[PDB]
Write an enzyme that holds these catalytic residues in place. Structure first.
Site, PDB file in Angstrom:
ATOM      1  N   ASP A  31     -13.305   0.449   6.820  1.00 30.87           N
ATOM      2  CA  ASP A  31     -12.560  -0.754   6.929  1.00 30.87           C
ATOM      3  C   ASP A  31     -11.993  -1.182   8.276  1.00 30.87           C
ATOM      4  O   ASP A  31     -11.101  -0.621   8.888  1.00 30.87           O
ATOM      5  CB  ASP A  31     -11.534  -0.522   5.908  1.00 30.87           C
ATOM      6  CG  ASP A  31     -10.407  -1.495   6.018  1.00 30.87           C
ATOM      7  OD1 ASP A  31     -10.671  -2.695   6.196  1.00 30.87           O
ATOM      8  OD2 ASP A  31      -9.283  -0.985   5.954  1.00 30.87           O
ATOM      9  N   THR A  32     -12.456  -2.344   8.678  1.00 29.01           N
ATOM     10  CA  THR A  32     -12.067  -3.007   9.913  1.00 29.01           C
ATOM     11  C   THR A  32     -10.683  -3.619   9.852  1.00 29.01           C
ATOM     12  O   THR A  32     -10.082  -3.829  10.899  1.00 29.01           O
ATOM     13  CB  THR A  32     -13.126  -4.060  10.241  1.00 29.01           C
ATOM     14  OG1 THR A  32     -13.588  -4.720   9.061  1.00 29.01           O
ATOM     15  CG2 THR A  32     -14.338  -3.360  10.771  1.00 29.01           C
ATOM     16  N   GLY A  33     -10.152  -3.922   8.674  1.00 29.46           N
ATOM     17  CA  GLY A  33      -8.836  -4.514   8.491  1.00 29.46           C
ATOM     18  C   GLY A  33      -7.671  -3.534   8.542  1.00 29.46           C
ATOM     19  O   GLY A  33      -6.533  -3.979   8.658  1.00 29.46           O
TER      20      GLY A  33
HETATM   21  C1  LIG Z   1      -5.205   0.139   4.545  1.00 26.34           C
HETATM   22  C2  LIG Z   1      -3.897  -0.401   5.097  1.00 26.34           C
HETATM   23  C3  LIG Z   1      -3.239   0.702   5.891  1.00 26.34           C
HETATM   24  C4  LIG Z   1      -4.164  -1.708   5.938  1.00 26.34           C
HETATM   25  N1  LIG Z   1      -2.973  -2.203   6.613  1.00 26.34           N
HETATM   26  C5  LIG Z   1      -2.815  -2.311   7.940  1.00 26.34           C
HETATM   27  O1  LIG Z   1      -3.675  -1.976   8.771  1.00 26.34           O
HETATM   28  O2  LIG Z   1      -1.514  -2.767   8.361  1.00 26.34           O
HETATM   29  C6  LIG Z   1      -0.839  -2.443   9.548  1.00 26.34           C
HETATM   30  C7  LIG Z   1       0.570  -1.745   9.609  1.00 26.34           C
HETATM   31  C8  LIG Z   1       0.770  -0.594  10.391  1.00 26.34           C
HETATM   32  C9  LIG Z   1       2.047  -0.051  10.488  1.00 26.34           C
HETATM   33  C10 LIG Z   1       3.130  -0.604   9.839  1.00 26.34           C
HETATM   34  C11 LIG Z   1       2.963  -1.727   9.064  1.00 26.34           C
HETATM   35  C12 LIG Z   1       1.696  -2.293   8.940  1.00 26.34           C
HETATM   36  C13 LIG Z   1      -4.598  -2.799   4.984  1.00 26.34           C
HETATM   37  O3  LIG Z   1      -3.955  -3.068   3.962  1.00 26.34           O
HETATM   38  N2  LIG Z   1      -5.720  -3.413   5.375  1.00 26.34           N
HETATM   39  C14 LIG Z   1      -6.358  -4.489   4.583  1.00 26.34           C
HETATM   40  C15 LIG Z   1      -6.362  -5.760   5.390  1.00 26.34           C
HETATM   41  C16 LIG Z   1      -4.894  -6.098   5.682  1.00 26.34           C
HETATM   42  C17 LIG Z   1      -4.343  -5.780   6.921  1.00 26.34           C
HETATM   43  C18 LIG Z   1      -2.990  -5.929   7.113  1.00 26.34           C
HETATM   44  C19 LIG Z   1      -2.185  -6.382   6.088  1.00 26.34           C
HETATM   45  C20 LIG Z   1      -2.739  -6.707   4.861  1.00 26.34           C
HETATM   46  C21 LIG Z   1      -4.091  -6.575   4.652  1.00 26.34           C
HETATM   47  C22 LIG Z   1      -7.661  -4.223   3.873  1.00 26.34           C
HETATM   48  O4  LIG Z   1      -8.299  -3.355   4.730  1.00 26.34           O
HETATM   49  C23 LIG Z   1      -7.490  -3.504   2.495  1.00 26.34           C
HETATM   50  C24 LIG Z   1      -8.213  -2.139   2.332  1.00 26.34           C
HETATM   51  C25 LIG Z   1      -8.464  -1.776   0.866  1.00 26.34           C
HETATM   52  C26 LIG Z   1      -9.658  -2.131   0.263  1.00 26.34           C
HETATM   53  C27 LIG Z   1      -9.791  -2.049  -1.106  1.00 26.34           C
HETATM   54  C28 LIG Z   1      -8.717  -1.599  -1.871  1.00 26.34           C
HETATM   55  C29 LIG Z   1      -7.520  -1.222  -1.286  1.00 26.34           C
HETATM   56  C30 LIG Z   1      -7.400  -1.306   0.086  1.00 26.34           C
HETATM   57  N3  LIG Z   1      -7.961  -4.463   1.476  1.00 26.34           N
HETATM   58  C31 LIG Z   1      -7.150  -5.188   0.674  1.00 26.34           C
HETATM   59  O5  LIG Z   1      -5.940  -4.961   0.478  1.00 26.34           O
HETATM   60  C32 LIG Z   1      -7.902  -6.248  -0.135  1.00 26.34           C
HETATM   61  N4  LIG Z   1      -8.189  -5.616  -1.413  1.00 26.34           N
HETATM   62  C33 LIG Z   1      -9.419  -5.667  -1.930  1.00 26.34           C
HETATM   63  O6  LIG Z   1     -10.313  -6.477  -1.603  1.00 26.34           O
HETATM   64  O7  LIG Z   1      -9.664  -4.802  -2.995  1.00 26.34           O
HETATM   65  C34 LIG Z   1     -10.318  -5.067  -4.159  1.00 26.34           C
HETATM   66  C35 LIG Z   1      -9.638  -4.362  -5.326  1.00 26.34           C
HETATM   67  C36 LIG Z   1      -8.396  -4.821  -5.748  1.00 26.34           C
HETATM   68  C37 LIG Z   1      -7.705  -4.120  -6.709  1.00 26.34           C
HETATM   69  C38 LIG Z   1      -8.252  -2.985  -7.254  1.00 26.34           C
HETATM   70  C39 LIG Z   1      -9.500  -2.549  -6.836  1.00 26.34           C
HETATM   71  C40 LIG Z   1     -10.207  -3.228  -5.867  1.00 26.34           C
HETATM   72  C41 LIG Z   1      -7.068  -7.544  -0.165  1.00 26.34           C
HETATM   73  C42 LIG Z   1      -7.268  -8.197   1.183  1.00 26.34           C
HETATM   74  C43 LIG Z   1      -7.419  -8.452  -1.350  1.00 26.34           C
END
Ligand SMILES: CC(C)[C@H](NC(=O)OCc1ccccc1)C(=O)N[C@@H](Cc1ccccc1)C(O)[C@H](Cc1ccccc1)NC(=O)[C@@H](NC(=O)OCc1ccccc1)C(C)C
Lengths: 99, 99
Positions: free
Chosen positions: B25-27
């Protein structure tokens, strides 16, 4: 364009006649963008990432000019910290991961 | 490797004598892995994702083989539904977004 990951892959998107910047997120299955004024008729929907679950509105059939490249898909709107170009448009602009 | 985004980009890792699957993951600026037995002192920390903030334990200077490529980094163990490999290691294995 070849983007390296030392810095957050933020791109320029023109959506809804509005210019926005957005993360290219291979980790999201879905495109989610912050509250924005947008045409159409929407549906309720909820999505989950880490921490929890947000209640988004689903807009099907939206045109985005991503990186001065277009696609048409689902843009969900809701309580996000960053606009996320998720996998359902990434494939359309033909983006891949390479190593 | 060339990875197209049509499917969810999971991949194999080897962290601490154990074998797992992780979303590349790039995000994420961070590798946050689910709970496992990792051996060492750990700091706490907290990260934001879309729905919230998870309380997670920092492990710094841990070796992972992501696709045959070993790399040393900092890895967060805590309550995630997926193991995420973030940009803190994606740089290290040479990964590049592309279109
Ligand atoms: C993994 C985290 C540490 C990462 N946050 C991050 O890098 O924040 C920086 C931070 C650092 C220090 C202090 C505070 C903040 C993150 O949430 N990254 C996001 C994109 C982002 C970046 C910053 C803030 C918010 C969002 C994305 O990669 C995730 C990964 C991931 C993938 C799949 C499942 C769980 C996590 N996908 C998501 O959260 C997406 N979910 C997704 O597509 O999952 C599908 C799914 C949903 C529910 C159940 C199963 C599958 C959402 C954008 C919709």
């Amino acid at each position: 364009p070849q983007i390296t990951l030392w810095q957050r892959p933020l791109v320029t998107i023109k959506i809804g006649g509005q210019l926005k910047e957005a993360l290219l997120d291979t980790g999201a299955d879905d495109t989610v963008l912050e509250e924005m004024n947008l045409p159409g008729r929407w549906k309720p929907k909820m999505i989950g990432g880490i921490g929890g679950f947000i209640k988004v509105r689903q807009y099907d059939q939206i045109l985005i000019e991503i990186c001065g490249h277009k696609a048409i898909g689902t843009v969900l709107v809701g309580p996000t910290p960053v606009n996320i170009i998720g996998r359902n448009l990434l494939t359309q602009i033909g983006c891949t991961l390479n190593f």
